Design an enzyme around this catalytic site. Structure first.
Site, PDB file in Angstrom:
ATOM      1  N   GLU A 120       0.838  -1.205   0.000  1.00  0.00           N
ATOM      2  CA  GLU A 120       0.000   0.000   0.000  1.00  0.00           C
ATOM      3  C   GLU A 120       0.868   1.249   0.000  1.00  0.00           C
ATOM      4  OE1 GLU A 120      -3.134  -0.187   3.077  1.00  0.00           O
ATOM      5  OE2 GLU A 120      -4.379  -0.892   1.397  1.00  0.00           O
ATOM      6  N   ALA A 166      -7.360  -4.168  11.801  1.00  0.00           N
ATOM      7  CA  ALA A 166      -8.287  -3.229  12.428  1.00  0.00           C
ATOM      8  C   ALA A 166      -9.680  -3.848  12.513  1.00  0.00           C
ATOM      9  CB  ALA A 166      -8.326  -1.892  11.664  1.00  0.00           C
TER      10      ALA A 166
HETATM   11  C1  LIG Z   1      -0.430   1.436   6.664  1.00  0.00           C
HETATM   12  C2  LIG Z   1      -1.199   0.445   7.598  1.00  0.00           C
HETATM   13  C3  LIG Z   1      -2.328   0.091   6.858  1.00  0.00           C
HETATM   14  C4  LIG Z   1      -3.274  -0.813   7.392  1.00  0.00           C
HETATM   15  N1  LIG Z   1      -4.479  -1.186   6.604  1.00  0.00           N
HETATM   16  C5  LIG Z   1      -5.423  -2.103   7.148  1.00  0.00           C
HETATM   17  C6  LIG Z   1      -6.643  -2.474   6.373  1.00  0.00           C
HETATM   18  O1  LIG Z   1      -6.811  -2.015   5.331  1.00  0.00           O
HETATM   19  N2  LIG Z   1      -7.589  -3.381   6.952  1.00  0.00           N
HETATM   20  C7  LIG Z   1      -7.349  -3.922   8.296  1.00  0.00           C
HETATM   21  O2  LIG Z   1      -8.129  -4.708   8.839  1.00  0.00           O
HETATM   22  N3  LIG Z   1      -6.155  -3.535   9.031  1.00  0.00           N
HETATM   23  C8  LIG Z   1      -5.214  -2.638   8.451  1.00  0.00           C
HETATM   24  N4  LIG Z   1      -4.044  -2.279   9.213  1.00  0.00           N
HETATM   25  C9  LIG Z   1      -3.847  -2.869  10.564  1.00  0.00           C
HETATM   26  C10 LIG Z   1      -4.570  -2.046  11.631  1.00  0.00           C
HETATM   27  O3  LIG Z   1      -4.131  -0.725  11.518  1.00  0.00           O
HETATM   28  C11 LIG Z   1      -4.188  -2.598  12.979  1.00  0.00           C
HETATM   29  O4  LIG Z   1      -4.397  -3.979  13.005  1.00  0.00           O
HETATM   30  C12 LIG Z   1      -5.056  -1.932  14.036  1.00  0.00           C
HETATM   31  O5  LIG Z   1      -4.771  -0.598  14.091  1.00  0.00           O
HETATM   32  C13 LIG Z   1      -4.760  -2.516  15.419  1.00  0.00           C
HETATM   33  O6  LIG Z   1      -5.721  -1.902  16.249  1.00  0.00           O
HETATM   34  P1  LIG Z   1      -5.339  -1.596  17.769  1.00  0.00           P
HETATM   35  O7  LIG Z   1      -6.442  -0.830  18.429  1.00  0.00           O
HETATM   36  O8  LIG Z   1      -5.095  -2.934  18.473  1.00  0.00           O
HETATM   37  O9  LIG Z   1      -3.996  -0.781  17.798  1.00  0.00           O
HETATM   38  P2  LIG Z   1      -3.778   0.729  17.364  1.00  0.00           P
HETATM   39  O10 LIG Z   1      -4.682   1.097  16.238  1.00  0.00           O
HETATM   40  O11 LIG Z   1      -2.363   0.848  16.921  1.00  0.00           O
HETATM   41  O12 LIG Z   1      -4.106   1.704  18.628  1.00  0.00           O
HETATM   42  C14 LIG Z   1      -3.235   1.752  19.764  1.00  0.00           C
HETATM   43  C15 LIG Z   1      -3.539   3.073  20.568  1.00  0.00           C
HETATM   44  O13 LIG Z   1      -3.006   3.012  21.741  1.00  0.00           O
HETATM   45  C16 LIG Z   1      -1.956   4.223  21.889  1.00  0.00           C
HETATM   46  N5  LIG Z   1      -0.839   3.703  22.599  1.00  0.00           N
HETATM   47  C17 LIG Z   1       0.112   2.831  22.169  1.00  0.00           C
HETATM   48  N6  LIG Z   1       0.965   2.589  23.201  1.00  0.00           N
HETATM   49  C18 LIG Z   1       0.529   3.302  24.262  1.00  0.00           C
HETATM   50  C19 LIG Z   1       1.013   3.429  25.544  1.00  0.00           C
HETATM   51  N7  LIG Z   1       2.147   2.862  26.252  1.00  0.00           N
HETATM   52  N8  LIG Z   1       0.375   4.228  26.416  1.00  0.00           N
HETATM   53  C20 LIG Z   1      -0.750   4.913  26.046  1.00  0.00           C
HETATM   54  N9  LIG Z   1      -1.233   4.787  24.781  1.00  0.00           N
HETATM   55  C21 LIG Z   1      -0.585   3.984  23.893  1.00  0.00           C
HETATM   56  C22 LIG Z   1      -1.653   4.566  20.691  1.00  0.00           C
HETATM   57  O14 LIG Z   1      -1.259   6.034  20.643  1.00  0.00           O
HETATM   58  C23 LIG Z   1      -2.937   4.310  19.898  1.00  0.00           C
HETATM   59  O15 LIG Z   1      -3.817   5.379  19.995  1.00  0.00           O
HETATM   60  C24 LIG Z   1      -3.074  -1.349   8.656  1.00  0.00           C
HETATM   61  C25 LIG Z   1      -1.937  -0.991   9.399  1.00  0.00           C
HETATM   62  C26 LIG Z   1      -1.006  -0.093   8.872  1.00  0.00           C
HETATM   63  C27 LIG Z   1       0.299   0.389   9.588  1.00  0.00           C
END
Ligand SMILES: Cc1cc2nc3c(=O)[nH]c(=O)nc-3n(C[C@H](O)[C@H](O)[C@H](O)COP(=O)(O)OP(=O)(O)OC[C@H]3O[C@@H](n4cnc5c(N)ncnc54)[C@H](O)[C@@H]3O)c2cc1C
Ligand SMILES: Cc1cc2nc3c(=O)[nH]c(=O)nc-3n(C[C@H](O)[C@H](O)[C@H](O)COP(=O)(O)OP(=O)(O)OC[C@H]3O[C@@H](n4cnc5c(N)ncnc54)[C@H](O)[C@@H]3O)c2cc1C
Lengths: 393, 393
Positions: A167, A314
């Site tokens: 991507e 996500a």
């Molecule tokens: C370019 C890219 C494209 C993607 N495209 C897709 C797609 O098209 N379809 C799909 O299903 N998935 C996609 N993904 C994967 C998806 O983004 C992740 O799987 C998803 O974001 C994980 O969700 P999460 O809530 O577990 O973590 P995150 O979205 O990363 O959220 C973590 C949150 O916790 C905060 N945080 C982290 N550490 C700490 C800490 N010590 N203390 C306090 N706050 C903290 C962060 O600031 C953040 O706000 C993509 C990922 C990337 C990098």
């Protein structure tokens, strides 16, 4: 008033909080949502600001804007550690005590111990990070005209040819003409190189889609090096292994999209983890903890049909959050909990602003159709957390 | 049959060329204009793209767009040396032979041998240089949010408080709010520091204008250190002399507006030069070559009345171009015309988008009046070289 603490306002966490908010009425539970920043960033869009194809403010929303301060107390601080025995979470500027805990701290980069990668290569994992990538690349391009011998200024090496890497290179390939025009740069000198250790681009993908992606990106000038691991990373480039011998690519920019692991706080806190992730029970809980739930990238689930793990996405994070909100609401009111079942629809990987590839509904999806399907699915999450109001912005 | 070669398509050069174009009836002179780039940049505007307040394309024009390919042949190459004896100018990619020579290669930075200033500080002297400055600054700000302890990312040191330094710090002061908005930076942490070796800001100018400028810029948060020399320059900042003792400023960006010298090519070509510049005779010719004319910053002229040297300016360079054009045209047609008489009107120094100061005609001019006076004067040059077409663009 039982205390529910949710760590990380990412997909799983913010959806869990919003779910608890919809399901519960005032004074029934004390809910605190902890995040590093006061905004929630849309991680799946982060590849576009990194490339410079979209402004970063379209990939985030203010958290306070989303939530109700009465039902949920928002805390902007950084989680440092978790103590299970005291049931206390340690922040940089504070302490929290929980009756129920939800861990949604997302991923950290997995560098596989490769030398210099952490120190000298960039990651697409936050608003800050992609702003840094974007400005770094614009800086190198600005530097080139004064120094036409340094073609390494115009070389961008992208490590990992998975979903994210593909991507990103697509976005980059779309951006190159405007960038070259902007900095008086000869497009023929620009090298976008995608380096993958695996035998194929997009492993685990339908080979037709892989070939289509490789043709489209190759046409737009992307170079693919497959079966080529990155042995080393240095401030002036990467060292790779070709035909069992070391070769050097001199590149001013190296972006690592090779792998992700669970956030290190989870593992450092004494949980038993696989790749920093927890293989959770049927009600998304940490094994041997009846009050600890894990969502998003921190949670590991295995597919029943095959025997391979579900990938960190996500989509499944969103479903994790919904299930946890329902289950916690039930748990507080003394009810019974429902097991988690992932419902995985197809996902589309873009090849720039105008193109994409995917398997949607079991059917292969190329071009503008795939691109629009992706845009729509992305619009759905926005409607989910912020409504039509968010969708308009 | 006679060949006129003009070196440098800057103010003096491009105006001399366009003037020669207007005066001659084709097929009488073979005129070749040599430039490092295929564009002519409006140097007096360069402080704005450096800060990021104006896009750089508005500070340049395509040379081919300006001239007639029939009368004037444009050559894009870099001058390496001048041979007076053989009447040959040697380029990186060629050689040229002239019956007439017009030298307008502009200025180079003069760092006066201060250690590290040349290697580690930026200069405002070309489109390339300012794109590099702008992107450098944006890069530092982008890096700040991830590393809030590094406040030096938000510190910009501008060495020299003359005309250019003041204009630049004004532009920066205008730019800071949007920039801070862009990179989530607290404006109170931003430091714009202007460092002058002289006892006063804007040395050699009327104190009323100086005080007004310090008041306005001081209001927008610019900090001034006067009577303060720069002892050294390093990648992390500058070392200055305060009260006879060394003090350090940690700054990720250092811009030098401290001094200029004539382009070193003129001195290296065996001309007799004062600070790299030539003291030309009354028909702007280099002593004692009757076929070599010098224009712009390469030329040194003394005012007959005040007996002081004239400053290196676009205004006098433009006048140089007009005079050499008329004199060369006359020389070709056997007319034997006029000596150079400078008529120096007032000059206005901008203090941002909305404000400026000057002594015009004889009156001190502040605010919107001065700003509009400056814009009008610049538009006059745009009209001179490109007409109403250029004026609208
Ligand atoms: C370019 C890219 C494209 C993607 N495209 C897709 C797609 O098209 N379809 C799909 O299903 N998935 C996609 N993904 C994967 C998806 O983004 C992740 O799987 C998803 O974001 C994980 O969700 P999460 O809530 O577990 O973590 P995150 O979205 O990363 O959220 C973590 C949150 O916790 C905060 N945080 C982290 N550490 C700490 C800490 N010590 N203390 C306090 N706050 C903290 C962060 O600031 C953040 O706000 C993509 C990922 C990337 C990098
Ligand atoms: C921020 C800044 C603001 C200024 N504001 C004002 C103002 O408001 N009013 C005023 O009167 N003056 C102003 N000046 C000064 C004015 O810009 C210069 O005095 C004037 O441009 C110099 O005339 P020039 O044509 O000789 O040099 P230049 O404008 O510098 O042009 C020299 C040309 O020669 C080319 N060149 C140089 N070396 C080579 C080489 N080896 N080979 C081939 N080509 C070469 C360059 O590309 C350039 O096009 C300002 C200067 C600066 C830096």
């Amino acid at each position: 008033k039982p205390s529910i603490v949710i760590l990380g306002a990412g997909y799983g966490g913010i959806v869990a909080a919003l779910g608890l908010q919809k399901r519960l009425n005032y004074n029934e539970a004390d809910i605190t949502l902890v995040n590093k920043n006061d905004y929630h960033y849309i991680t799946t869009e982060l590849h576009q600001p990194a490339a410079g194809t979209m402004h970063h403010d379209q990939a985030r929303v203010g958290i306070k804007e989303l939530i109700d301060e009465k039902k949920i107390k928002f805390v902007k601080d950084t989680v440092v550690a978790i103590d299970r025995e005291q049931q206390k979470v340690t922040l940089q500027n504070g302490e929290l005590h929980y009756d129920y805990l939800v861990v949604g701290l997302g991923s950290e980069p997995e560098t596989f111990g490769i030398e210099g990668l952490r120190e000298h290569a960039f990651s697409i994992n936050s608003i800050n990070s992609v702003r840094i990538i974007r400005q770094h690349i614009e800086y190198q391009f600005a530097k080139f005209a004064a120094e036409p011998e340094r073609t390494d200024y115009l070389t961008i090496v992208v490590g990992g040819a998975g979903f994210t890497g593909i991507e990103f290179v697509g976005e980059l390939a779309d951006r190159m003409p405007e960038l070259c025009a902007e900095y008086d740069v000869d497009p023929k000198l620009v090298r976008i190189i995608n380096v993958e250790a695996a035998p194929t681009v997009l492993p685990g993908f339908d080979p037709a889609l892989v070939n289509y992606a490789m043709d489209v990106l190759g046409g737009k000038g992307v170079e693919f090096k497959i079966g080529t691991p990155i042995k080393r990373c240095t401030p002036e480039g990467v060292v790779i292994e070709v035909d069992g011998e070391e070769e050097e690519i001199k590149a001013a920019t190296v972006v690592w999209t090779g792998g992700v692991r669970g956030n290190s706080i989870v593992e450092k806190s004494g949980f038993e983890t696989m790749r920093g992730r927890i293989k959770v029970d049927p009600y998304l809980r940490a094994p041997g903890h009846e009050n600890i739930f894990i969502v998003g990238d921190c949670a590991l689930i295995i597919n029943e049909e095959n025997n391979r793990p579900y990938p960190p996405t996500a989509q499944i994070a969103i479903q994790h959050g919904e299930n946890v909100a329902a289950n916690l609401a039930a748990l507080i009111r003394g009810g019974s909990m429902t097991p988690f079942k992932p419902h995985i629809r197809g996902t589309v990987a873009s090849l720039g602003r105008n193109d994409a590839i995917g398997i949607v509904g079991g059917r292969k999806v190329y071009g503008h159709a795939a691109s629009w399907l992706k845009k729509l699915e992305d619009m759905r999450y926005l409607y989910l957390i912020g409504g039509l109001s968010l969708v308009l912005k």
